[PDB]
From a paper:
The membrane-bound rotor consists of a ring of eight identical c-subunits in close association with a single static a (or ATP-6) subunit, attached to the asymmetrical central stalk (subunits γ, δ, and ε) which extends from the membrane domain and penetrates into the extrinsic globular catalytic domain along its central axis. Focused local refinement of the rotor (c8-ring plus subunits γ, δ, and ε), the stator (subunits OSCP, b, d, and F6 and associated supernumerary subunits e, f, and g) and the membrane domain (subunits a, A6L, b, d, e, f, g, j, k, and the c8-ring) improved the quality of the maps and the resolutions in these regions to 3.5 to 3.7, 4.2 to 6.0, and 3.6 Å. As it rotates, the asymmetrical central stalk brings about structural changes in the three catalytic sites, found mainly in each of the three β-subunits, which alternate with three noncatalytic α-subunits in the spherical extrinsic domain. In the current structure, the postphosphate release angles are 28.8°, 26.2°, and 25.5° in states 1 to 3, respectively. Therefore, the rotational angle in the F1-domain is not influenced significantly by interactions with the additional components of the intact enzyme that are absent from the isolated F1-domain. The central cavity of the c8-ring contains a poorly defined, noisy density observed also in the porcine and yeast c-rings (S13 A–E). Here, the upper half of this density has been attributed to a mobile lipid (including possibly coenzyme Q10), and the lower half has been ascribed to another mobile lipid and the C-terminal region of the e-subunit, which extends toward the central cavity on the inter-membrane space (IMS) side of the membrane and could just penetrate into the cavity.
[name] ATP synthases occupy the inner membranes of the organelle and form dimers via specific interactions in their membrane domains. Each monomeric unit in the dimeric bovine enzyme described here is an assembly of 28 polypeptide chains of 17 different kinds, organized into a spherical catalytic globular domain that extends from the inner [name] membrane (IMM) into the [name] matrix, attached to an intrinsic membrane domain by a central stalk and a peripheral stalk (PS).
Author numbering:
A (entry chain H): 15 to 146
B (entry chain G): 1 to 272
C (entry chain Q), E (entry chain R), F (entry chain O), H (entry chain N), J (entry chain M): 1 to 75
D (entry chain P), G (entry chain K), I (entry chain L): 1 to 74
K (entry chain I): 1 to 47
The structure:
Amino acid sequence: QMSFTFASPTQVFFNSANVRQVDVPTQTGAFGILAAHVPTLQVLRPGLVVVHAEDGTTSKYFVSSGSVTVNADSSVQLLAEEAVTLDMLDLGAAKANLEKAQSELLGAADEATRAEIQIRIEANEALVKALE
Amino acid sequence: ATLKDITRRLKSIKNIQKITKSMKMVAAAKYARAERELKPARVYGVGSLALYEKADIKTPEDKKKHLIIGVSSDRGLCGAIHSSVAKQMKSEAANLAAAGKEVKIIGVGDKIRSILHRTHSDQFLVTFKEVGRRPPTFGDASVIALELLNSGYEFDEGSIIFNRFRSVISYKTEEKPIFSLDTISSAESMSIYDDIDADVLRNYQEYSLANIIYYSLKESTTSEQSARMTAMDNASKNASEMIDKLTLTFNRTRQAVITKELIEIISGAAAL
Amino acid sequence: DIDTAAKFIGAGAATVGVAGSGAGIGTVFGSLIIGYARNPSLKQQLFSYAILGFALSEAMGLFCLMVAFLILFAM
Amino acid sequence: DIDTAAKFIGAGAATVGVAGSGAGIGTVFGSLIIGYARNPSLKQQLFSYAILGFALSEAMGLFCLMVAFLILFA
Amino acid sequence: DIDTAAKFIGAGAATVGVAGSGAGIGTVFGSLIIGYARNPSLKQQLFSYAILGFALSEAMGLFCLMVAFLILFAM
Amino acid sequence: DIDTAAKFIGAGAATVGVAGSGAGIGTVFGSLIIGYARNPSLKQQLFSYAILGFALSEAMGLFCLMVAFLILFAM
Amino acid sequence: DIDTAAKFIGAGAATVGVAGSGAGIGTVFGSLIIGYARNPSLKQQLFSYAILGFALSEAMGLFCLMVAFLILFA
Amino acid sequence: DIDTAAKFIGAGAATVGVAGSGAGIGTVFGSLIIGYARNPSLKQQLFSYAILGFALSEAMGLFCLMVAFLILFAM
Amino acid sequence: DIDTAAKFIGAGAATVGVAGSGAGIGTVFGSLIIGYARNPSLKQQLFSYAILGFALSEAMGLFCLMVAFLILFA
Amino acid sequence: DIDTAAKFIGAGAATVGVAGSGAGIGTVFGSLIIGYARNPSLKQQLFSYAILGFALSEAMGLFCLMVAFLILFAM
Amino acid sequence: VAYWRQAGLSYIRYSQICAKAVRDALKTEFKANAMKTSGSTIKIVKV
């Protein structure tokens, strides 16, 4: 079966525990990992991962970015730079920051600066959809 | 001996004892923080290294360019840890240079640069300072990884050399590999991994470099703080016993002075 | 009886058009299998899309069958 | 006459062009399923693209039926 | 009679419509193979969807075959 | 008539070539959906490629329709 | 008698149904190749499913062929 | 003349082969879209391959078209 | 002869079963290319399965062609 | 004449099969494009497999053309 | 390849930016103790 490890630099959510199904958002596309998934090495994009416990229970966590590894022997490591429980966020703050970020979006100084700001919009949009 | 010289010595050693006691106290608090901070960082680092453990990657021998990273601080009142990591760095650099491989150094901390300045300073790319002033955090790992990748050196294989923390008194100088993408994509052992482009691997390696750097920083900070704690404790106990001896010497000298002064006074009174 | 033979041949050639619905339904359910293997938690939405693809190619299957029976029976 | 017989044959042949449209509809909706499963946050745009592809691959077989009915009653 | 000849003609033409079940079953089981390759833990539900899709293409296979048999004998 | 009757049969047989164009259009737009789902950041160029793909499937699967009308109307 | 002509035309017409078997077999074994390359560790279940798809496609393929011969042998 | 009738029927049943070219060109452009979506940095080479596949499938369809026109015009 | 005519058109009708096997061969070689581009280390087993698919779909194409040749000379 | 009519109809029916080759080349070249966009360094081997598949679909396309010409011209 | 790879960025900058954009959306009580241990105090010295 699965051996899942969900970790941020300052926190550990699952320390080689066991779960039934983990739906991760990845850069190429979100997918669900089960007891014998095929080995993959995806990186993360700002989204929310849902973890199905051994019972029918489920939990949600917003991951800013990171990396997901699905080892051959069904060992899964999901590392996130900032993974926060879904109740630790404000919809108002997310909306305000998204609106502001788009308010200087058209002021694209250089392509690198435009990419930086536009990643800010992408993260804010994914977070808002997570809360709207 | 001389009363004023012994008095100054006793005062100075008392100052040394109490200042090293203060340093021991602050180091104990700092280590208490650092152990709790390291507790999940171990899980994070192990989870990062899981891929390079499960996949038996090796070294494409024809590749030459190599990196060596040493993780320490800029403070040096704890002693042996900087010497140990530096010794491991010299051993690896010498061996790999003898293997005809261009070896480069990035030293995290002022002490690595100081103890390798006289000999290997020409090979350094970048050194970082102001580590250990504040507890390490993932932003430091991010900035170190950025200054590595942005630098004009595309290494083929690297090694991070740090002190793994074992107990309050035990630290071991360990070294962990760091793989370039050219090694990862040109290994037939990892081919089983699905849905990995040539661009997913760039992101994964650029992130696992920061992951291993952060893990090393956490382990090194914890081991350094414990080492400073035990070194200051030993110094305090040595200063305490030395004060204990000096107090006996001071008492003997004071009694001798009293006896000599009374003898001289009674002799002078007998003269007249 | 030349019309009697033409009816038979035309209906036989008309019923071929169900092949397109066969291939299409195979494709939609194969893609449902794949997409449910990838993202299982969207089972419900994937199934609601598979039903739509099913029915909306069975539409053309029924167009071909209706033309076939039209030739066979209703002039 | 024989002419009505050949009209029957022509209608029964021309009505099979709808098979390609059926297969194309199947392909469009199957790839819509796959694309939605890969990126669930693009639902609306993916459905719009699917409906556009449906409209086109539908019209192609619909004109096959149009020619079949034209031959049948003209 | 020429109608008896057209019975065979129409039957041979109507049996052409099994090629659609062809493409359909091929795609369904190929996509089951791929889906089970990626996520083997879902094998039961993947196989259930595969049986559903196979049955749904075989339904039109039997539509074409029953039309052929109807043109042959039961008319 | 006989020759005009065979012209009608020929037009009916010629129109079957539209099936390939229908299948091609389905493939093109399905691939657009998949590619866009992988990369939404290329919507413009992906659609501009599918326009060319549809145009060249359509303008080449419509030659069969054109020659069907050539047989039917003006020999 | 024209019944021989009917039998010959019907036999020639029925056997195109093997085109579906050809396409289905091509697709099944192509997906088997892709699935085996994506995950070699299950090449006994990938192969079981491949031969099962074989059976389920050749069933209708040989149904088309046997109907063709029955038309020739009615 | 039954020969004219057969020329018409043969051209009609011959021009249908462009269906394969239609499906193939659709497949080529769809896979162009998917491949370019996966990595847009070698669009040049992908487009060149797409052009070559287009030309091949178009010419294979033109063989059916020319057989049709050769039966229609010549004999 | 009417029967020689029927034999000719019946063989022509039997010939169209080759298209499905051609499409299947195209699909199997395309998926072989895909699998090789995914897992080049295997290669040999991918080619074994691909030659199996090619030979085995050619089997059905040749079944159609044998039916055509039986229509022509029997 | 009936022979010169049957030969025309049979050739028209026979030249269809190269639609399969057209679809085969379309699939082969599309897969070439995708597989080269995934791992481009295997370009030469991918092209070798592509030309293998193309020639091996042209094999049966040309077989259909040769049976058509054998019926139409010589026999 | 994503739009930040053309622009000349690395996945480290992507991760930093996404992490900060998550930072700014915390409940203001949680931002207090998420600010601590989220800085970059390393100073670089060149050659």
